[PDB]
Write a protein that binds this ligand. Structure first.
Ligand SMILES: OCCn1cc(-c2ccc3c(c2)CC/C3=N\O)c(-c2ccncc2)n1
Ligand SMILES: OCCn1cc(-c2ccc3c(c2)CC/C3=N\O)c(-c2ccncc2)n1
Lengths: 280, 278, 228, 280, 278, 228
């Protein structure tokens, strides 16, 4: 199927790390990216997570969803996917600090929303949506990144050690299966929030175990006034509705997609009123 | 000047010794993506940590930014940390605990009197004893920008953390003192302070993070049994562990404790008990 | 010999982006008194529009800096005086040429519409900076020329022709930026745009493409105005 | 698997046609494109071709290879794939006539060569490489289009009614199985030829049945002098070697890819010598 | 002015009748991608085809460019084309063939004397007889740009094409005459001129394109048996079918043929034989 | 008061893209006699480089048209005369200012290197159009200034500093475009680029990024030259 021989891949550089491995800019029929386990051993739990990763990536074929080229089991096990130009969205927000005009930002949101709708359509919970996952291929297009703990319905909860994007009900961990589409929706809302505030959520909160408690008990909430001054009001209300602490009132992804499409249809692309252009 | 070039890996946060100085050295490869402008700030305060030395504090060496990572230049320790040594040895007697308590107390007071900054985190894995028997507590919350980067980080399996500094943004040194009291209790018992376990386990000597935090904030801090701990020791550690900051053991009444005097007067060679554990 | 030579010079200059040269050349072209054709008037339009647009952008950015704001404020003010003097000089030259040789001798209706459009445009550019009785007079004159152009267009000109549509674009921007009456701009732009919609396929593809571009611009800026 | 329900897809417009169907700009989780059979009936031969199309598209996951989102069997059978911005390469060459600088052109060749190398790696013959198939998504990136008669090794020849790209040995049809990697290589060379001449191959020849005979008997050959004056000489020799009438002397795709990579390493991006740039 | 708006589809290149004129009309939806600047050229010569009418040529109506396609406005014909009518009826007697031959001959001469252009293609499917019995040959190679677009097109299953115009770019009207002779032979036999088939099939009355073209260019054109065809007919069609252009039947010696006179003198109502086929 | 006010005016003008204004302002800045700092000389560089680059592009395009070629040839020739006069005037002003107030009073080595680089650049720009004894004199003077700058750089300046690298870039382009000796350009650019390679990591990231940009430019143009 997508098996990959060990010798062919030409690993180049350690770009970064995270999520059960480290990323290399391999070379297999042009630019790729390889997620690789640092430890050589085939630990059964990480092996099973790898198998689930393979299956879920094989379940997806969308344009805005990372293109899983293959999985190699020989030597240290790895996943080879498309190399994405530019770094992740987290870098483009809080490391590059490149400005995003509201047109571009809403486009990014629309694309990634289409991606999430695709994952949900084939009955997959991403379970790990963040800003480190979103990748910005050139031309302002978007791809949803790793799906390491993303799984199908299968009708296990792991902190995955990623706070500020996890949902409060996911944090609370009462029913032993608190992973729903609305959890992914709340992750989406958090991504929108950090896109439209310019910083990470809950800036005033500092300590990690402080912020987990503050968002968990619900004492703390994202400060909507911290958003950009210049942004469409419908988008603001959509962010607020998507970040609702209560699960059932967060919007399912087709509805948020419809709202975003309405926003696109009512997008003031140019703040100034352009007149007669210089002919030809 | 210091760099990662003259760094020879030995063992394991990697244990990578210094080449030219001949000193076995340790690097902390805690890395994540930050704005480089923020990254400017971290080195200068680490220099201040280098210019301060205490007989109960880790060896400090100038840190630096490598090719995409933040490394820390700390001293070697065959004792490693407290977590694995307690895991191998099981439990710890009163004398060793008291000597560790005075070590950490005077180290944090040294911090509070020299660097004018609080610990901002205390953890038994951050407690560690030299191979020759010296407690060399390290990795303080000295640098604000590092703590800011660590805001976006993993989830703590057992956040030995003061509930008052959790719930309310009004925080004080007494909160770190409560944290260190909890660390002392944990190293005494040998397990996370879950509600008191079976009398079987006490006679012998998986839970989610958020509900553990709820237990800490709501339920009283765990008590210390008198059948395995001296009355003064448990009483004083409980006093240090009270949730109300009014009766929290401030530094002065921390040194006031009689068991502090017993630990000062007693003779416990950490090297001997370590070799017995080693 | 003079007219075609100067026109070739103007084309050489538009391929050279240097603008003062064909500005003077087309000034001499108009003062000659020959009835300008489509190509010559189009080149006039492009040249004058860009030579004023550069300074217009300069004034816009310096005004944004002034809004960003003590000595720096004074020097921004004096530089604004300079750029306003430049715009006034160049636009006054343009309008004098228009009402001297172009408008009075314009026989065919389309060239009359074109000249009225340009006149309204430059009156608008003055209104951008004009205040007091200056603003009053320039605004009244701009509106008079504008309503004249729209009347002559609706009387004897194609609704879906590029000139009438871009006409409407400039009407709408005039109503918003100067008259400060966004509603009137909204309905006028929408009704002209609907008139363009109705007869979109009446004309050929060559006009159709540019018409589509400019009515896309109309859609954009009407959405801008209704976004508020 | 990739089954698609009939009601969900929102077909919009007939962009074009060709290759066992017609293309519509559907709507299924954002922009798509649907290849659909005009006749409702399930003719067994076209059904089997459709099944092979499904299997071969499921065999491919590359970035430069069209992303097959799914195949729907209910009602009139169809394939839904990524909607590609901009028309096909044939349009961008002989309908748009947009100029391609040699940098951009060689980039297009490199990308599509990587794509062909991918098809060949998993043992697929495209069998139908043309200029109508190549699609140019925004940012000058490339995707290899339909694979309607593209098949795996399976160790049938059809004229497919597409002349000027078919290989002479494919035209001759002597062994009843004249479909090899070198056939695809020759198709690649023809695409390079039309990219680097600005017109269709064999312009002076007009009649279709004239040109089939002329290229088949070998009397006619592509006029290399007709290529662009401005182009790297190594590229010219690669085109000539790739268009060799004799099969065994045409280069296998990894070698042509290596040659193109060398060309990239020796690419004079700017004809003029840029000096000190205007600082910041 | 003409447009596809007033077009009511009837049957099947779609058979779509004209709405306002009340005339059943036919559209040729042969479409492909061309530069629109080239697309400018096609309509004007089709206008010239409209302004010319012959009693043995198709009805011509002004064509136009629709939303992305090139359509042709030709007349209706219940006879459709020759391919299906020969498929249903099988074979064709000498008289009908001779009358079709004179029809196509005089139609192409009408073309050569009016539009000053050669056929550029002749094909039995392009031969077609009116429901009332009139041969209305259509779709000439009048427009250069259409032929240029058709350069990039499908593969011809049976290219009834003159080998001299194939091999050498020197071409002449005699080549089209050879093509029409081949078309006549094909409609006579009822099958593609593969090498002469079994004597069984003759008594009764899959191959690749490139090798068929090779057979045409190399092997002699197929002969006509004398047991089913009159001697003059076969002799004259062979004369028209000779590969050497020197003895190819030019227009004058085309009308010279005695069987041409027999077809003119004979009475064959195409409508009657069509209804017998219909 | 004059110097800082004029400098703020120059910054306001660079945010305004209007160039004649800070051209005159920096002329007055230099004539004052104050020792220019890094920011002021950098602004001088940017302003003069762009104000000459616009006209340089104009001359390049009109020369391409002239090569494309009877009356049109004459008018292209006369317009070339105009643009050459403009370039000569502005560049002569630049060099006079340099050798009047900047070069003689330049104490720190880096500013001396900077001024020599600018002088060589404008001598090169003249050589672009100079012919006969004009070309001979300007080429000799440009080479003298160039070798002077390179000597002072290699004597007392950082090899991997941005100024020395961009220096080398302009040396290489001078050798190709003017001296018509592509080989010498090739080896000089390559050897300077290798010197930049050797000490790439000696400096900080802030210099490292711009150095990488300009040595990428060096790689590009050396590949351009070796492509032939
Ligand atoms: O610090 C993290 C930086 N970083 C992580 C990745 C990444 C993340 C997830 C996954 C892969 C790569 C490959 C497979 C995968 N999930 O399956 C990338 C990246 C991926 C593709 N193109 C460019 C960059 N950068
Ligand atoms: O005249 C026809 C022009 N034309 C054909 C296609 C096309 C070709 C092949 C295939 C698909 C679409 C979909 C599936 C497929 N092969 O599986 C496209 C196109 C595809 C995607 N985005 C834009 C345009 N345009």
């Amino acid at each position: 199927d997508w098996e990959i021989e060990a010798s062919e891949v030409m690993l180049s550089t350690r770009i970064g790390s995270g999520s059960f491995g480290t990323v290399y800019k391999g070379k297999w029929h042009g630019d790729v990216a390889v997620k690789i386990l640092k430890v050589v051993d085939p630990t059964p739990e990480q092996f099973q997570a790898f198998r689930n990763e393979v299956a879920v990536l094989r379940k997806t074929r969308h344009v805005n969803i990372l293109l899983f080229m293959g999985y190699m089991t020989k030597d240290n096990l790895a996943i080879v996917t498309q190399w994405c130009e530019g770094s992740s969205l987290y870098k483009h927000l809080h490391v590059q600090e490149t400005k995003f005009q509201m047109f571009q930002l809403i486009d990014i949101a629309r694309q990634t929303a289409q991606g999430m709708d695709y994952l949900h359509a084939k009955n997959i919970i991403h379970r790990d949506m963040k800003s480190n996952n979103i990748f910005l291929h050139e031309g302002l297009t978007v791809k949803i990144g790793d799906f390491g703990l993303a799984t199908v319905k299968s009708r296990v909860e792991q902190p995955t050690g990623s706070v500020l994007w996890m949902a409060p009900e996911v944090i609370r961990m009462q029913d032993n299966n608190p992973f729903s589409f609305q959890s992914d929706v709340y992750s989406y809302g958090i991504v929108l929030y950090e896109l439209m505030t310019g910083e990470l959520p809950y800036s005033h909160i500092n300590n990690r175990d402080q912020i987990i408690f503050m968002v968990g008990r619900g004492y703390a909430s994202p400060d909507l006034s911290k958003l950009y001054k210049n942004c469409p009001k419908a988008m603001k209300r959509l962010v607020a509705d998507c970040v609702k602490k209560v699960k059932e009132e967060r919007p399912l992804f087709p509805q948020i997609l419809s709202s975003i499409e309405l926003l696109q249809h009512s997008l003031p692309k140019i703040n100034r009123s352009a007149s007669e252009p210089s002919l030809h | 000047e210091l760099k990662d070039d003259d760094f020879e890996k030995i063992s394991e946060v990697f244990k990578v010794s210094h080449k030219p100085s001949g000193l076995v050295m340790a690097r902390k490869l805690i890395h994540l993506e930050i704005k480089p402008a923020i990254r400017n700030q971290i080195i200068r305060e680490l220099q201040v940590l280098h210019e301060c030395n205490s007989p109960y504090i880790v060896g400090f060496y100038g840190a630096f930014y490598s090719d995409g990572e933040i490394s820390i230049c700390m001293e070697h320790m065959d004792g490693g940390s407290l977590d694995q040594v307690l895991k191998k040895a099981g439990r710890i007697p009163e004398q060793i605990l008291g000597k560790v308590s005075i070590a950490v107390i005077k180290g944090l007071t040294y911090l509070r009197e020299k660097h004018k900054i609080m610990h901002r985190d205390v953890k038994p894995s951050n407690i560690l004893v030299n191979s020759r028997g010296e407690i060399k507590l390290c990795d303080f919350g000295v640098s604000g920008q590092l703590i800011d980067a660590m805001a976006n980080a993993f989830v703590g399996t057992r956040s030995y953390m003061s509930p008052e500094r959790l719930q309310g943004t009004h925080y004080s040194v007494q909160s770190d003192i409560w944290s260190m009291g909890l660390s002392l209790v944990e190293m005494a018992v040998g397990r996370y302070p879950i509600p008191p376990p079976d009398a079987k386990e006490l006679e012998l000597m998986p839970m989610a993070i958020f509900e553990l935090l709820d237990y800490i904030v709501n339920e009283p801090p765990p008590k210390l049994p008198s059948g395995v701990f001296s009355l003064e020791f448990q009483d004083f550690v409980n006093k240090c562990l009270i949730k109300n900051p009014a009766e929290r053991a401030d530094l002065k009444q921390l040194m006031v404790h009689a068991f502090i005097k017993r630990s000062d007067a007693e003779e416990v060679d950490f090297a001997g008990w370590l070799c017995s554990t080693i | 010999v003079d007219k075609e030579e100067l026109v070739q010079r103007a084309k050489l200059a538009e391929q050279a982006e240097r603008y003062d040269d064909m500005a003077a050349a087309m000034k001499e072209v108009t003062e000659t008194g020959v009835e300008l054709s489509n190509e010559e008037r189009n080149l006039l339009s492009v040249a004058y529009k860009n030579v004023v647009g550069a300074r217009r952008s300069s004034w816009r950015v310096i005004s944004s800096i002034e809004q960003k704001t003590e000595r720096k404020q004074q020097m921004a003010k004096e530089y604004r005086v300079k750029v306003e003097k430049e715009l006034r000089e160049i636009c006054y030259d343009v309008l004098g040429l228009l009402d001297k040789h172009l408008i009075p001798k314009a026989s065919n209706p389309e060239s009359k519409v074109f000249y009225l459009k340009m006149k309204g445009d430059y009156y608008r550019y003055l209104a951008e900076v004009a205040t007091g009785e200056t603003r009053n007079s320039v605004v009244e004159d701009s509106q008079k020329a504008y309503q004249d152009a729209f009347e002559i267009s609706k009387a004897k000109m194609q609704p879906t022709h590029p000139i009438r549509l871009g006409l409407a674009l400039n009407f709408s921007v005039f109503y918003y930026e100067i008259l400060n009456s966004p509603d009137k701009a909204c309905q006028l732009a929408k009704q002209a745009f609907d008139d363009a919609i109705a007869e979109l396929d009446t004309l050929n593809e060559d006009s159709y493409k540019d018409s589509t571009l400019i009515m896309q611009l109309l859609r954009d800026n009407l959405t801008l105005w209704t976004s508020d």
